[PDB]
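Posting here for the record, re: PEX.
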Amino acid sequence: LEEISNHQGLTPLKLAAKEGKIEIFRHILQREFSGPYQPLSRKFTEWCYGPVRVSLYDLSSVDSWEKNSVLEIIAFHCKSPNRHRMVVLEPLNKL
Amino acid sequence: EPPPMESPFQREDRNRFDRDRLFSVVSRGVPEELTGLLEYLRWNSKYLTDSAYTEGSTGKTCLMKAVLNLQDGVNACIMPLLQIDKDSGNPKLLVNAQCTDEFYQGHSALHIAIEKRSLQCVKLLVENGADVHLRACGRFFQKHQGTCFYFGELPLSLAACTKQWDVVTYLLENPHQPASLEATDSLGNTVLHALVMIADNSPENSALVIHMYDGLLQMGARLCPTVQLEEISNHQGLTPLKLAAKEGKIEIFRHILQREFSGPYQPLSRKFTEWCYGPVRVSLYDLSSVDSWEKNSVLEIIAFHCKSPNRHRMVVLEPLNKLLQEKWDRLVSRFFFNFACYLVYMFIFTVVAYHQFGESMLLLGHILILLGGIYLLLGQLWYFWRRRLFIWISFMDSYFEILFLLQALLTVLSQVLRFMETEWYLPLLVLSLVLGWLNLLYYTRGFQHTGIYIQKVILRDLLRFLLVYLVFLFGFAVALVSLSRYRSILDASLELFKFTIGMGELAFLRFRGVVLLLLLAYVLLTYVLLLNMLIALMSETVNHVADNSWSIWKLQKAISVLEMENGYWWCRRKKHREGRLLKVGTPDERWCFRVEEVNWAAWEKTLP
Amino acid sequence: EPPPMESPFQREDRNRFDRDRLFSVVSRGVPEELTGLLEYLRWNSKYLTDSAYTEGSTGKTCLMKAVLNLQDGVNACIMPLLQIDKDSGNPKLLVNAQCTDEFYQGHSALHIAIEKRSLQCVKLLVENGADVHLRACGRFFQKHQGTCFYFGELPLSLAACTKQWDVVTYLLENPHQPASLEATDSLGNTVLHALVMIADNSPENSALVIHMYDGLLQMGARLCPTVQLEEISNHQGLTPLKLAAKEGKIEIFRHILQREFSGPYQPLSRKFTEWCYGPVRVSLYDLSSVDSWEKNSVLEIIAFHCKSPNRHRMVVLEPLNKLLQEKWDRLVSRFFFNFACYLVYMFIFTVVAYHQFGESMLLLGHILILLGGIYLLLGQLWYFWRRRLFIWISFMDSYFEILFLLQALLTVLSQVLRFMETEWYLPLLVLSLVLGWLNLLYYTRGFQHTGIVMIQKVILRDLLRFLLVYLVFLFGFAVALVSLSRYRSILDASLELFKFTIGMGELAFLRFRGVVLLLLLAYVLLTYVLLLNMLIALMSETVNHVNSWSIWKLQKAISVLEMENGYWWCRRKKHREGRLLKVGTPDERWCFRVEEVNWAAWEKTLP
Ligand SMILES: CCCCCCCCCC(=O)OC[C@H](COP(=O)([O-])OCCN)OC(=O)CCCCCCCCC
Ligand SMILES: CCCCCCCCCC(=O)OC[C@H](COP(=O)([O-])OCCN)OC(=O)CCCCCCCCC
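Prediction output follows.
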């Protein structure tokens, strides 16, 4: 259901990026589930050693390699005053 | 890029019972599939620690993976795997295997067992011969700006930093191989040093560090009463108190300074209450390595070696505040005698510069000026030779030394040029005169009323806004000069700058309109930049910062005292030790310092 | 310098039973080890209070060492020690022995027992003849900066300041030696004065002080009912209310002013409620020692003798606010008559200074100017003679009294110089004129719109510091610029630089032109930095979200309390405020009626 695009060509993650809906955008980016619902997640924990936590983030529709990605939408297609708050979210910050 | 320690998705790097089958089995936890591994190892003449049975880059063994994949705090393959390893006749047991990658160098299965908070795994590994003094020397375990976790390097320090009292108790009290609280990592840091280094001035971390520090001190007193753990020095030459002083860990430094215990642990105390009467409390403070009589004292470390912004908050703690106040009260006359000498020298400077039998007096003034410049140049050069680090690590509280050195250099050069009869001697002399008159404001710190009375920002805003303003200035200067060809780049820059500071006025010829447009644009842009100046400086004020000017003045007085205490460069001054030798328990004689505290608010909180 | 009162680690200085054995025995608390002391004293003909058995520097005896080492509030050697002292036939009892060192002078074992909160030890000492009126008058027990603890100087005062009701009750009601409430320390301060002094405006401390003040008033109503404790004056002539007014202890001052008791304790009240009607409450306030009719009243002490910053908040408390409002309403016409007289005098001054029967009128104007200067000089000098200390203790709200004197002195000097035909009388005359026109602003406090500061406080504080810094800069750059031109003299160069700094004139600029320009640029940048620093430092106080009405009310109070005395050439008779009403038993007081309306407080009492 995440991959369905509306008439503007935007998936729900991309739509949340464009509209400036930061909270749901962060939740979708950092979605984590355990047990039977793990495949629906976008973030996977690899290992933890004390304070250090290392996790894998899915880069589908987020990496700028794809045309009309989340990064491009935030940089040039979003107009909300919350854009600078979205670039500091994982995995956007380290990417 | 270093490989992940234990990734469920990424297979181990390379860079029947193969390595991949064994890793799959030990990750699942069922020991039944391990049957037949020993026979294959014996037939192929291989040990579990060989290169093919470990991750290629790090050297992580199957035992570490088994510990990394603990489930419900236990992994059923640990004991069978160790049994197979010991039955294989391995000359170096699998328990003591360590990683080889530069990132994870020194990492062992015991470290993973302690980190995973599984006491059963630690007990099982120790019972089988794990070395409890292995050091994790990899870059992941050193302290640096990045992805790292510094806990010392020893398993005992790891247990202490992770708030695992049971693990510490077992490691120090196990009969198989008892851990030693005296053990040190690669940097010489013991467990107390490691606790100090992980300390953050947040209340929660400070409470955790204080609790574990006190617990380890008491347990060391119980287990090793013949040694003092707080006297161990690392490779930097610092005890845990001095290490906390240097690194800026204020909330544990204060606790160590004012530590007090009653009962069997009284010898571990540093504050001893003598008597109380209403709101008045009098206590004896241990001056061990605190008084400036000893080399690398806590006072000197705070004043000259610490670079933390908490420097001035540390010199206002007891007994440091009272000790420095007494030192200042003892050396207050020496400070003002120096002020009087400098004032007389500056008066002679002013007379000689103003007057550029009378000729003999002028020559006497010139030679006195040369001698004064020589004396200050030698005095400042010795100061830099002693404190090369202090000037660099903190410029806001040491720029007056640089100004004194520059004034001495300019005075000496001016006298040398005057002897050489070079025409440029007078500008150097007048610059020296004005700089020396400005240097007279150093001595305002002696008395409080003007001593307490932007400087932080000027090193934080000017270095950016001058760049922007100079870009504006050069652009408009070249634009005006090229259109007028105002006759040179420096001329236009000087005129525009003088108008900007309001000193001069602009003069307007073909293309008068374009010149007027350029001048209007420059004026408006500079006004916006000045507004940005004023706004940036203002926001720091409405921030509601605390009144730390008093503490900054106290720290300035502390630096002045600690430099005056050494005497002049031509006459070493004998050090006077603070406090008196007193017996405080058991032959336990310490140099205690008596501090008297009056606190109505605290006392009233004890009344019914 | 003084030795510690008690030190577990440091032994007493020295400036069978020797001193050390006895002190160790009484410190450990075992009484059986004291056997043989009495026999030794009898054999050596010694006494237990001799210098051989006390600390050399202070005089701390063995008993005081025993009390300083209480365990769970009891020490087993105190009673046997007192018994040994009595059996030894000592002409001066070991109890009531006191220190002699200047720091702990007068300190006794009863003070230690009370401070240690051991009621049992107090009972034991008092039973054995402890004097409950001993005064601990050493430097440690006096009010000053540094390590000290002021609690009065009496055991009753020490028990009161330490919040010990049981010990206070025992001391007041013991039969062996009853303590006296009206007893005074070396400064004449009773227990109430001591409670006032130890009070600070924090809420918990104020609550403690108020609680024990009311309790001691009730105890002084029970015992010695014929003695009015609040009317006792110390060596400075201050009652507890007046002492609270002087010290600036606003909380206890307000509590005493508005004290109201119900039931049997009605005569102790100072505020009496008359009638209520909804949000309207009308109460009588006792003006004893409050009305400015008497000499050294509470109003005068607050206006002219208090120096605490809490001064302006005290004059808005009832009944002070309404009393001062009534006085100001009565004397508002006299104030503006003075304003009109000064305005006419300044108009004549302006006309005469401007125009230097025309000639005869100008001479008459000069004579009038001289007469006005003589009058104002006499008035200001009398004011200083009366209130010398008020000028020093609060300059921020009394500098007009200096400016008026300076204007009168300058006017007199100008006139006498004109008489001596000196040509230096015009500058003095014009300075007198401008200073009088400046002093005309004093009367703006007569009406609220202009009467109702923050920058005035900071400038009067930071003026000297900023002047020091800026004058160092100015002198340095002036001498640097003068020396390089050899800008005629140091004064001329300083004047040029200052006039440019305040924007009055340009800067003058001959080889070494670059160096002169560099010096001028450095001066300009440094002065801009200094002025920005001053602006921000002044700014940091304004943005604190910080009371102008209280300051204006205090100004009006000062003006009223000065106007009541009348002119120097005409003393004015004062009128008592309120009326002499009876409030109980013939307990007649000069009560004052204040009506107060408070909807917010009344609406809370509704269900
Ligand atoms: C030519 C003098 C030969 C040596 C005679 C001894 C004179 C005492 C010198 C002295 O006390 O130093 C004064 C001052 C040092 O300032 P500082 O180190 O405190 O400041 C450190 C700042 N970071 O240094 C000066 O003022 C330098 C000039 C000293 C001579 C002045 C003439 C009057 C002598 C009585
Ligand atoms: C020739 C007249 C000689 C004086 C006779 C007495 C006339 C009445 C005096 C009078 O009202 O004085 C008012 C004023 C008092 O000073 P202040 O309390 O305002 O000041 C203290 C503030 N801190 O004092 C003044 O303003 C002084 C002016 C004196 C000349 C008046 C000319 C007009 C008279 C009708």
